[PDB]
Design a protein around this ligand. Structure first.
Ligand code: SSA
Ligand code: SSA
Ligand code: MN
Lengths: 421, 394
RNA sequence: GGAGAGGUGCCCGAGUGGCUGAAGGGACACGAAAUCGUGUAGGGGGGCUUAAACCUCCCUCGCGGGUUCGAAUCCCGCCCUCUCCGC
């Protein structure tokens, strides 16, 4: 959600954002409807002022006028009722249009679609094996960690791990939580479902609604990320300035429909319906300086996690057309997956300024007493099992076993993962 | 699913089981409908030796479809040692550990959560009633308990597994969750998928259609998966806080064994001792409860619940539920094995909770609370938490 | 799936139709141990103004709608909380 007052006064700023982000939105029709709504409000307020007048002047009034004054206030009520209905319809349509308005991206973001995504940093590189390397699926098959029977049970885009790799998945999640905890972030375990209000607050609705699984015969939807829950926690609250910034490390199972992924990542751990993810969520004051600081921290935290996992990664600056309607800036972190001979996303670091805060009604009281919309940020801490794909391939041994990075030995109690069958 | 031939030979035994388990099922209408399917098969065999033949096959389909939906409701006879009656007839087998002694008025787990800021009650507005969200050390504690249960089970000879929380209809039918407990399961809209209330649904479905080798038996699985349940109660101390919620985490013990009462009794005992030893290591007072036939479920041969003591309520609360189902699930899920004589037989299935959060946290908080309001960590969990006492956040 | 009790400002809480955007107590801040005094919601129009400040009007007493001359108060739907039952 953008500032409506700012939208009226700098509309070309938002029209340029619409184009660069590929949003299908008629900004002029939006501005036309807004002017209708504002006019109709003025009318309603005119009737409501008379309503309140007449109501105040009925009690102490001469009986000879009493009848006429009550009948007059009754007609005022019937007209306000007619205006409220007209205003209710128009504001509904204006809401649907306003939920599509994108936030203008930061100038440094490449303008274009996915093609314009541009690498900015690279740490470590493709490993050089003195043996023919195996893909992660094959490694799991060799070590007996893969349960292919799960597709018969649960359908495509499902997975089930066996043996040490199952314990490895749960260790990776705790490894990420412990890391985030000792970086100042408050750990939280959260549910994986919420009502529509929460998806509207983050921006997942309406733009990404087909990516969400709904729970039938309920008003609930399965969340694809703990961001949905963490962002909705403080809706309608006016937080104190001294509480800021809020740094949350929320773990929750994730569910994703993966609509429109027909033909992409059909086999493996890369693109499944249900996974595990530890989320970084930051709520800070309405300051570019503070947002830039939190953004850098979220990136560094994710990078450090990958450094401890001993994985070669790269940062990618995401282009306007691949960035999302609400994003000021987005930087993806990609880890190299040899079997695909290319880097694959593992994290997505996003600054959204007040765009989510204006949807979820996230506000704080600054030191001077002014209530202002906060700025929100989020980034992956660690998500399984996609990360396991890189871990298996980058840490495979000659004999087909998989090493465990130094930082994970205390969690697993072994230096090399033991096979099952 | 019960054996058809067994049902024809001894119908009185399955009348007794319907009465003692209280199943809304007319067995005489099922038997009559079974005879009616047999008569239609006697007409077709006379046409096979010698349009009218296709009309008898279009009636057969309908009759068989009705018979199948009605066979899925036939209960398994319980073991004689099970009390007859409802929940009131549940009999305490034993109890281990005494109620805790406090030199101060104990707090309930919600109050302990409020005091230390381990609670996020704002989740009710985000996700609706009957939800929870943990903060600080209690959040870390929940994840520690799950890894602890998986490490324990893995050292006890069970194969650890991380599993999805959704499956197709066949898997719920295969365990018995469908059609009896359909209204306890959330469906995923615009899919043919349903959210599982227990990893039992996935573990039982894995080997559907396979003939397992005798040597591979017994199968011992410790599957972890988030759990989803449509009914988490309404309000009150029975559901308040961490006690009953729509989504939770559970580590599931699941055993598939050969078709012998000896093998099943051995497995049943193992599932108990595992949960008991988990509760022992968690330093929690618990008790075992034999479940009566009417509170047992249609497919259960024997069910023992394990309950843990909750001081604020001065009562025991169910934390584990240990079941033996003989081949009642195997006949639904098509779980078969080859015995040493080379004969294909339906296997026996068992399951029991290993550990489920966050309900177990309610007992942990109240039983291990200190005077100042902190909560100590049992020795078995210090390596997982890195501290002896849970520190507060807010 | 039911029964009863509720939801008011920073919190507890008074309000059986207008004297209530709101008493009293606590908390906090400021000013003049205890005491006294003052202060203590958000949103949106309009006037004036560069702006701010100031003046004025409208909406919100969990959310939305309805009744009425008039609603925090009465009705309806939804949401949440507590206690007892159902599963
Ligand atoms: N379908 C999927 N299967 C497996 N992992 C996935 C899937 N979708 C996302 N992930 C993992 O979750 C991470 C976050 O995904 S994201 O949508 O791009 N970003 C977010 O959700 C933000 N909340 C920041 O985490 C991905 O980088 C990837 O590691
Ligand atoms: N709605 C719920 N909220 C919190 N915990 C629950 C909930 N439902 C079940 N549990 C926990 O999960 C355990 C297993 O529940 S059970 O249905 O009785 N048993 C099973 O599901 C069997 N598959 C064995 O686990 C319970 O004993 C309890 O500890
Ligand atoms: Mn209910």
């Amino acid at each position: 959600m953008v500032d409506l007052k700012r939208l009226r006064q700098e509309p070309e700023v938002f029209h340029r954002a619409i184009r660069e982000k590929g949003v299908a939105l008629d900004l002029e029709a939006l501005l036309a409807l807004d002017r209708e709504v504002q006019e109709l409000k003025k009318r309603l307020q005119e009737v409501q002022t008379e309503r309140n007048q007449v109501a105040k002047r009925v009690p102490k009034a001469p009986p000879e006028e009493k009848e006429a004054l009550i009948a007059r206030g009754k007609a005022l009520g019937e007209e306000a009722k007619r205006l409220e209905e007209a205003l209710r319809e128009k504001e509904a349509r204006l809401e649907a249009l306003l939920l599509q308005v994108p936030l203008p991206p930061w100038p440094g973001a490449p303008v274009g679609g996915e093609e314009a995504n541009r690498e900015i940093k690279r740490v470590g590189g493709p490993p050089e094996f003195s043996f023919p390397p195996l893909d992660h699926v094959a490694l799991m098959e060799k070590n007996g960690w893969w349960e292919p029977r799960i597709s018969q049970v649960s359908g495509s885009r499902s997975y089930a791990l066996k043996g040490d790799l199952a314990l490895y998945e749960l260790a990776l999640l705790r490894f990420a939580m412990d890391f985030m905890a000792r970086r100042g972030f408050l750990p939280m375990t959260l549910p994986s479902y919420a009502r529509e209000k929460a998806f509207l607050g983050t921006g997942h609705f309406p733009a990404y609604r087909d990516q969400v699984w709904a729970i039938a015969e309920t008003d609930l939807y399965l969340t694809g990320t703990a961001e949905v829950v963490l962002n909705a926690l403080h809706s309608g609250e006016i937080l104190p300035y001294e509480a800021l910034p809020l740094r949350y490390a929320g773990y929750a199972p994730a569910f994703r429909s993966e609509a429109g992924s027909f033909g992409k990542d059909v086999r493996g751990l890369m693109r499944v319906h249900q996974f595990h993810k530890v989320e970084q969520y930051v709520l800070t004051e309405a300051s570019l300086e503070a947002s830039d600081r939190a953004f850098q921290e979220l990136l560094e935290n994710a990078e450090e996690i990958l450094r401890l996992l001993e994985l070669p990664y790269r940062l990618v600056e995401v282009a306007t057309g691949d960035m999302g309607p609400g994003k000021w800036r987005q930087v993806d972190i990609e880890v190299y997956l040899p079997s695909e001979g290319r880097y694959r996303e593992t994290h997505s670091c996003s600054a959204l300024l007040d765009w989510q805060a204006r949807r979820a009604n996230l506000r704080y009281r600054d030191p001077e007493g002014r209530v202002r919309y906060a700025y929100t940020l989020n980034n992956t801490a660690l998500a399984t099992p996609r990360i396991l794909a890189m871990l298996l391939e980058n840490h495979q041994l000659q004999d087909g076993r998989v090493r465990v990075p130094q930082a994970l030995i205390p969690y697993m109690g072994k230096e090399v993962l033991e096979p099952c069958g």
